[PDB]
Each structure stands twice: as C-alpha cells, then as structure tokens.
Amino acid sequence: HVFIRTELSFIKNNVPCIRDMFFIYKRELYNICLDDLEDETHIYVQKKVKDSWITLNDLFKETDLTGRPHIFAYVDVEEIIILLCEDEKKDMTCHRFYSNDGKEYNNAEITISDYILKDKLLSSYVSLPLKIENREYFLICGVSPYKFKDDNKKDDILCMASHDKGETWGTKIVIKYDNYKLGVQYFFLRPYISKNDLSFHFYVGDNINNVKNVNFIECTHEKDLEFVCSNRDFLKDNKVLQDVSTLNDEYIVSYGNDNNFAECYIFFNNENSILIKPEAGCYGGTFVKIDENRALFIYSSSQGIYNIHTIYYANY
Amino acid sequence: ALTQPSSVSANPGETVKITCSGGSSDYGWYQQKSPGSAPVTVIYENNKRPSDIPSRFSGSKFGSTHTLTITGVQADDEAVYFCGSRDTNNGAFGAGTTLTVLRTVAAPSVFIFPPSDEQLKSGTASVVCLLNNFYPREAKVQWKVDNALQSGNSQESVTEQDSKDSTYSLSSTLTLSKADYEKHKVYACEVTHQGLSSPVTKSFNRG
Amino acid sequence: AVTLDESGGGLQTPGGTLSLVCKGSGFTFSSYEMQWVRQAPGKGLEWVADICIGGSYTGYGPAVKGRATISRDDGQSTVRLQLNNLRAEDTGTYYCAKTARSDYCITGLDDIDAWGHGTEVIVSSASTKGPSVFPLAPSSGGTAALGCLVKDYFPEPVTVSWNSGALTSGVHTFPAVLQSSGLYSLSSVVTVPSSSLGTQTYICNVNHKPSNTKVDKKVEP
Ligand SMILES: [N+]
C-alpha cells in the first residue's frame, strides 16, 4: 500500500545568497549561490558537506560579461553544465562551464546566433536532458510576457534545444499551449523533466512580486520534436499552490496556508498528506528530486539557515 | 605561469611596489627571508592584511596585475617575496622577487683561519677565508698558494642581506689534501671588492 | 595562536614512500581547506596538494600527481601527505598551510593565512654521517673573531647555538655547501672584542638530528 518517511537536517551558509539554485549531481546536493550586495559579484557553486555549504568555485570570476546573467544548469549522468547568459540583441552570448566532479569547471564563450527566444522573457533554472528519439536535449525555454490576440503563427512558449551538451543550439522544440489567457503577465517559466516527459511550471500574475499564481502544464509528445501541453489543476480551496514534483509516477504538491507560507502541506498522489510547520515560515519551499522515491524539500527559515526536509515515498 | 619580477630595490623610508602580471584569480604575497625557513603571509585576499603584519603593507588588483606596496621600507622588510594565485590548470606560485635595501658602501673585515690540529691529521685539511659585513654583494675570491693562482678547487657561500645593518657575509674554502697542504708554506687570500682601492690580501705562515 | 607543526621529514629511500604529518592548533580545524607546499633547495616555492572540508575534494600538483595522498584526521587536527616512489626531485622543505576562509575551497594559492615551520625531506640512498667539529682560532687589534667549522656530514640541517641560546648578538649563520664527495660544510662565526679573550668561555653547540650527535667544542686561541 503506501510508505512515507520524513527526516530533516539543517545547513549553515556563510555566503548571503540573493538567489539559490539547488541541484543534485551524482546523488549529491549542490547550490548555485548568487552573491551580489567594490561590489565583487559572485556566482559561487557550493556543495553540501555535513551541515554546511562549502564554496567550490566562482563562475563569475572567469567571466567577461557584467550584470546578473541567466543561469541554465543541466545535470546529466557523467557531468554538470552551467551557462551564464547576457540578457541585453540579435545574438545571445553565453559562457558555457563544464564540470564532472562539481569543483573543477572549464568555461568556453558560446554564441547562440540569431536566437528564436528574442522577444520572449527568460529566467534561470536547473534542468536535466530530455530524450526524444535516441537523442538527449538541453532546453532553453522562454514565455511571452503579455498576450492580447490568439496568434497561431507565433507560439507562446518557445524552446531552443541542444543535443551536444550545450555547444550548439540549433534544434527548435515546438510547444503548443492552448490555454494561454489574455492581458496578464506570465513569468519564471521553468521546464520540469522526469521519465523523459516534459512539463512546465510558470507564474501568472500582475507583477513579478505583486501577484504570483503558480501554474503547471503537462505536455505530451505528439510528433517528431513537437509537444502539446494542457493545464493541471492542483488547486485546493483555502491553500496556496507552491511547488510540484513527481515521485513514483505520482505528483508531490506543496501548498501554503496563505501567501505568507506560515505552514506548508505536502500531498502525495492527493491520496496522502503531511504538514511542514517551521517553529519563521516555509516561504520559497522547493522540491529537489533526488530519486524516483526520494526528494528534498528546501526552504530557508533565516538568512544563512537552510531546512533540508528529506522525503521518502512509495506507493503499491 | 605568474610573471613576477626577478628583483626590486629601494632606500629606507621610501615606498616600493612589486607586481604580478600572470594568473587569473585573486593574489597573495608571502615573504621569506631565507630558504628553508617558513614564509609569512604579508597579504592574503587582494587588499587583506594579517593582524601581526604592519600597516605599511597594502595590495591592489587592477586587471590581471596586482601590486604589493611597502610604504616607508624598513630593515626587517628584506626578504624574497612570493606571488600566489591560480594558473590556467591549477593553483600556482611566482618565480620570487628579491628585495634589497639600498645603503652606503661597506668594506669587508677579512678574517683568515688556519685548520685545527685534528683537521690536518684527518687526511684532508681546508683553509677558511671569511668576509664579514660588506656592501654590495659584488665581490670576488682568488686563492694564491705560494704566489700561484688556484682555481676549480674552491667553493663560496654567500648569506642573505642582514635584517639590522643590511650587510652581506662571504665564506670561501680551499679543498686541499694532506699531501698537498704540507708542501707549501705561504697561504694567501686575495679579496676583490668595489669599495676597495687595493685588494687586501691576508697571509698566514705554516709554523 | 594559530600554529601548524610538521613531522616525518627525514632521509627517505629513493623508491620508498613518505609520510608527513601537520598538526594544527589555535583555529577550528575541519572548517578550513588545508594544503602542502614544498621548496626544492635553491629553487622557489611549489604547490604540492590540497584537501577540502570533510575531505570532500582532493587535488594534487602535476609533479606529485598519481603518487601523493592527502588525508585529514579532523579529530586529531592532522593533515597527512603520503608521497610514494620518491625521486631526487622530491627533496626539499615541506610547509603545510591553512586557507584564510572557512568552508571555502576555490582553487587558488592567494588565500593562505597560516604557514607551518617546515620539515626537511632528503631523497637519498646515502647513510647518515656525523659532523666533525674543528675549532678555528685567529693568528686583529680591537675586534677578534671566533668560530667552528662543521665538515663531513649528511644530510641537512644543523642547529648551531652559542652558549645554549644565550649569545645571539653578532652571530652569523652560513648556508652549507655541497662537497665533491657528497657531504656538506657549514660554518658559523661570532664577532667579539679583543678584551674578552681569556675572561669569557665560548662553546659552539653543533646538533645533528639525523645522526644524533652533540659535540661541545671550545674555541680558544
Ligand atoms: N585553496
């Protein structure tokens, strides 16, 4: 029938990150800390070692470009690839970092000549290869901020793919999102890949901070390099949808009590339920899936303190 | 590799500047008065200084270049300063920069030493020529056994600049055997220096 | 009192292995990246290896890659460098070092804030020899010179102190020179006035750690 086991640890961090970007490489947890308060800006690659984040390398030090770039990190079996991309132009200019231990990185300046994602809003995320027809692909996906008429010629979500570990971005994945509603802002679009199945987790609101309703669309593969998505209704009355992940081919949905996240509720297959109530809140709670039956739920209850909830789940 | 200067020089009280062009990441400077003796961290992060190190030391990283600055140099500031940063592959060190404090010319007070009783009986006896507290390092040592020039069988040993009066010290030794030492009587030591009009040659008798 | 003390540095066999231990005190060991840095006689400084917090990462210099092994006993506050197949190129003085930042392992040598005293290693197939002490008396005027000559000894180093560490003023220590046979020759002199010849006693204490020989020779004209 079912199995739920939850243990939690803490992680101290002596680097005050503006934004955290967790990832699991070779079954271990790493962070992509952005340190930007003589303002030496850093894009540190930290790693969890016992109960502390250990800084391994600064990617911004080895970077020609300025400003907070777009960070796209891809975690395949035998390597990490992280891209730092200048936002503002006809061509995109990225810096491609490669590592296979988590500490050693070797950058290479890349140029996405005449990119399609121009005009589309991009944002930083961690992803994993998506296999389509005997070929894995890394995805840089963008959304159209505002829509006023239903143009078919122009698709709302656009994805450029790379089947050479991020070296050349010439493939175009066609995303067909049939529920794109008019007048409102759409932001923080990040794809969710699992079991070689594609989905997108984005926000729909009035402003990046004013209104932030979480949306989730699951896509099916219609034909060669073309996907067609539809919305997934995770709405629970008197609860705020926060993160969505999958364990055991079942959704793991995070909800808050209000938009202040004093308490979080985690639902498994909607069949089972647990409560996260930081003794501080659970704001910014995210699932960092480790395995098909194990995920992490991380939020920071203070500056420098991370709460690492480890969740084990299995259904039969 | 990190491109560090071979040597730099300045008079006391004057400000000095040492550079490091090679390398990518931040820079550090470690002084080492004598090889074998542990170095001392002078600056660690680009413009960070340890509590024990005096306020005269300061750093600055302008591009791939970092300059270590010693405002108002002192006698205890003479050392071989090293550059520390990262090279294309991994962490790397510089070639080393030798700092010399500029002072007036000092002549060497030469002291010749005949071998001990035991030294002779041991089958091999060596003559010791000593030069103490001179300036600059510019010096030459020529051996003259019975009015004849000797070369090839003599090795010299120079010490680093003194941390009090900024003077050097030389040590020569004529490697000779028991059969070749008792044949001669007059043993002279010619000393050549910049601060000497005539070469001071000290000679000692066998008896 | 952030201090590091090295041990295990001696005359190891060419082909054999080495084991150098660095014990740390004064700082919270385990929270700082540790490193080893060597210096070949005459040559400059050279990075050997580094170990990250909790031994999570282990890096080596090209010179010792596939031969050296760095480990940490966070409980004993020690860092062990285990270098195998010792070539003559490994001879030098090894200093362990502490990185200034805690929970920080970026690959750089700019962040060292604590250096160990330095232990000397000698890769050689030559047996330890004893130092022969020969007193040198002058044959001056106002200021006279006295001292002893340390000849025929192997390997380095040799700690010579006048009056067991009481006489430090006017003491000049010379570096040893390598003879044609293979042994070293160190010298040490002390500048004392001519009025003190007869009323004071000067003895040079030659100490050789590898062969354990302490000979107290008196210098008298
Ligand atoms: N380091």
What three-state secondary structure class fits B124? strand
**E strand or H helix at B89:** none
What is the rounded (10 degree) CA torsion for A55, A57, A60, A61?
110
The phi, psi pair for C55, rounded to 5°, reads 55, 20
Amino acid at A302: S
DSSP labels, B65-111: EE-EEESS--GGG-SEEEEEEE-SSSEEE---EEEEE----B--EEE
The phi, psi pair for B127, rounded to 5°, reads -90, 135
- Considering only CA atoms, give the Rg of chain B: 22
Q: What span, in angstroms and rounded, lies between the C-alpha atoms of C23 and A157?
A: 59
DSSP C54: G
DSSP labels, B37-49: SPPEEEESSTT--
Per CB-CB distance under 8 Å, the chain A contacts of C75 are none
Tokens representing C8 are 């295990």
Picking from C158, C162, C196, C155, the residue whose alpha carbon sits closest to that of residue C174 is C158
Q: Which residue of C has its CA nearest to A105?
A: C107
Per CB-CB distance under 8 Å, the chain A contacts of B24 are 61-62
Strand ranges inside C29-162, DSSP E: 32-39, 45-51, 58-60, 70-73, 78-81, 92-102, 112-115, 119-121, 132-136, 143-153, 159-162
Please answer whether residues B66 and B84 qualify as being in contact, where contact means their C-beta atoms are separated by less than 8 angstroms: no
Q: Is C102 on the interface with A (CB under 8 A)?
A: yes
Q: Which residue of A has its CA nearest to B62?
A: A38
Picking from B122, A16, A52, the residue whose alpha carbon sits closest to that of residue C52 is A52
Amino acid at B191: V
The alpha carbon of C56 and the centre of ligand 1 are apart by a number of angstroms equal to 13
The verdict on C111 and C144 lying in the same domain is no
Interface of A with C in 45-104 (CB under 8 A): 47, 49-50, 52-58, 101, 103-104
- The reply to whether B109-205 shares the fold of B7-101 is yes
**E strand or H helix at B170:** strand B168-177
Q: Is B25 on the interface with A (CB under 8 A)?
A: yes
Tokens 């380095």 correspond to what residue?
A: C156
Tokens representing B132 are 């103490």
The verdict on C53 and C85 lying in the same domain is yes
Q: What span, in angstroms and rounded, lies between the C-alpha atoms of C47 and C34?
A: 12
Q: Order of strands, edge to edge, in the sheet holding A109-112?
A: A109-112, A92-99, A79-85, A70-76, A125-127
Q: Which residues does A278 contact at the CB level (< 8 Å), separation at least 6?
A: A299, A301, A307
Beta bridge partners of C215: C206
Distance from CA of A25 to the nearest CA of C (A): 14
Domain annotation covers residue C126: no
Q: What span, in angstroms and rounded, lies between the C-alpha atoms of C175 and C172?
A: 10
Domain annotation covers residue C127: no
Domain annotation covers residue C96: yes
Q: How far is CA B9 from CA A147, B22, C193, C209, in A?
A: 70, 21, 34, 38
Please answer whether residues A116 and A160 qualify as being in contact, where contact means their C-beta atoms are separated by less than 8 angstroms: yes
Tokens 């789940």 correspond to what residue?
A: A313
- Chain breaks of chain A after residues with C–N above 2.5 Å: 37, 88, 279
Picking from C10, A95, A100, C52, the residue whose alpha carbon sits closest to that of residue B91 is C52
Domain annotation covers residue C10: yes
What three-state secondary structure class fits C64? coil
Cβ count within 10 A of residue B6: 8
Burial (Cβ within 10 Å: 0-12, 13-18, ≥19) of residue B150? middle
Helices (H), chain B: 117-121, 178-181
Distance from CA of C140 to the nearest CA of B (A): 9
Q: Which of C56, C101, C106 sits opposite A49 (nearest CB)?
A: C56
Domain boundaries, chain B: 7-101, 109-205
Please answer whether residues B40 and B82 qualify as being in contact, where contact means their C-beta atoms are separated by less than 8 angstroms: no
What three-state secondary structure class fits B77? helix
Picking from B86, B94, C101, B2, the residue whose alpha carbon sits closest to that of residue A61 is B86
Q: Which of A40, A49, A57, A306 to mutate to test the interface with C (most CBs of C within 10 A)?
A: A49
Q: Which residues does A238 contact at the CB level (< 8 Å), separation at least 6?
A: none
Q: What span, in angstroms and rounded, lies between the C-alpha atoms of C101 and C111?
A: 7
Picking from A89, A43, A98, the residue whose alpha carbon sits closest to that of residue A66 is A43
Q: What span, in angstroms and rounded, lies between the C-alpha atoms of B68 and B79?
A: 13
What CATH number is associated with residue C155? Answer: 2.60.40.10
Q: Is B71 on the interface with A (CB under 8 A)?
A: no
Q: Which domain holds residue C46?
A: 3-121
What domain count does chain A have? 1
Cβ count within 10 A of residue B168: 20
Per CB-CB distance under 8 Å, the chain A contacts of C105 are 54-56, 103
Picking from B27, B34, B142, the residue whose alpha carbon sits closest to that of residue B85 is B27
Q: Which residue of A has its CA nearest to C104?
A: A55
The alpha carbon of C109 and the centre of ligand 1 are apart by a number of angstroms equal to 6
Please answer whether residues C67 and C85 qualify as being in contact, where contact means their C-beta atoms are separated by less than 8 angstroms: yes
Q: Which of C121, C140, C174 is where one domain is finished?
A: C121
Binding-site residues, ligand 1, Cβ < 6 A: C 33, 50, 99, 107-108, 111
Any idea which fold B7-101 has? Immunoglobulin-like (2.60.40)
**Residue C98: how many CA atoms within 13 Å on its side-chain side?**
28
Show which residues on chain A lie within 8 Å of chain B, measured between beta carbons: 61-62
- Put simply, the answer to whether C62 touches B89 (Cβ < 8 Å) is yes
Picking from C184, C134, C178, the residue whose alpha carbon sits closest to that of residue C158 is C184
Q: What span, in angstroms and rounded, lies between the C-alpha atoms of A241 and A266?
A: 10
Beta bridge partners of A255: A241, A265
Distance from CA of A56 to the nearest CA of C (A): 5
Please answer whether residues A242 and A256 qualify as being in contact, where contact means their C-beta atoms are separated by less than 8 angstroms: yes
Q: What span, in angstroms and rounded, lies between the C-alpha atoms of A250 and A287?
A: 14
Peptide bond into B136 cis (omega under 30): yes
Q: Which residues does B48 contact at the CB level (< 8 Å), separation at least 6?
A: B59, C100
Q: What span, in angstroms and rounded, lies between the C-alpha atoms of B156 and B158?
A: 7
- Pairing state of beta strands A226-231 and A171-177? parallel
- Put simply, the answer to whether C57 touches A56 (Cβ < 8 Å) is yes
Cβ count within 10 A of residue B65: 14
Please answer whether residues B135 and B104 qualify as being in contact, where contact means their C-beta atoms are separated by less than 8 angstroms: yes
Q: What span, in angstroms and rounded, lies between the C-alpha atoms of B20 and B29?
A: 10
**E strand or H helix at C192:** strand C184-193
Please answer whether residues A85 and A93 qualify as being in contact, where contact means their C-beta atoms are separated by less than 8 angstroms: yes
Buried b / exposed e across B80-94, counting CB within 10 Å, b at 16+? bbbbbbbbeebbbbb
Picking from A279, A283, A275, A288, the residue whose alpha carbon sits closest to that of residue A300 is A283
Q: Which residues does C175 contact at the CB level (< 8 Å), separation at least 6?
A: B157, B158, B159, C186
Give residue A165's region: left, alpha or beta (phi > 0; psi -120 to 50).
Answer: left
Q: Which residues does A94 contact at the CB level (< 8 Å), separation at least 6?
A: A83, A84, A85, A86, A109, A110, A111, A112
What three-state secondary structure class fits C173? strand
What domain count does chain C have? 2
Q: How far is CA B166 from CA B76, B100, B135, B161, in A?
A: 9, 8, 8, 5
The phi, psi pair for B75, rounded to 5°, reads -70, -45
Tokens 């002490």 correspond to what residue?
A: C133
What three-state secondary structure class fits A153? coil
- Considering only CA atoms, give the Rg of chain C: 21
Q: What span, in angstroms and rounded, lies between the C-alpha atoms of C162 and A30?
A: 58
Q: Which of C54, C89, C121 is where one domain is finished?
A: C121
Tokens representing C164 are 């067991």
The alpha carbon of B20 and the centre of ligand 1 are apart by a number of angstroms equal to 19
CATH of domain B109-205: 2.60.40.10
Largest CA-CA distance found in chain A, in angstroms, rounded: 58
Amino acid at A296: L
The verdict on C138 and C117 lying in the same domain is no
The verdict on C52 and C92 lying in the same domain is yes
Q: Which of B89, B130, B189 to mutate to test the interface with C (most CBs of C within 10 A)?
A: B130
Please answer whether residues A79 and A100 qualify as being in contact, where contact means their C-beta atoms are separated by less than 8 angstroms: yes
Distance from CA of A124 to the nearest CA of B (A): 25
DSSP C53: G
Between CA C112 and CA C120, with CA C116 as vertex, the angle to 5 degrees is 125
Q: What span, in angstroms and rounded, lies between the C-alpha atoms of C63 and A144?
A: 54
The verdict on C191 and C172 lying in the same domain is yes
Q: Which domain holds residue A188?
A: 1-316
Q: Is A31 on the interface with C (CB under 8 A)?
A: no
Between CA A297 and CA A309, with CA A303 as vertex, the angle to 5 degrees is 15
Q: Which of B44, B82, B128 sits opposite C136 (nearest CB)?
A: B128
Q: Which of A50, A55, A101 sits opposite C104 (nearest CB)?
A: A55
Q: What span, in angstroms and rounded, lies between the C-alpha atoms of B194 and B139?
A: 7
Tokens representing A60 are 């911004």
- Put simply, the answer to whether C106 touches A57 (Cβ < 8 Å) is yes
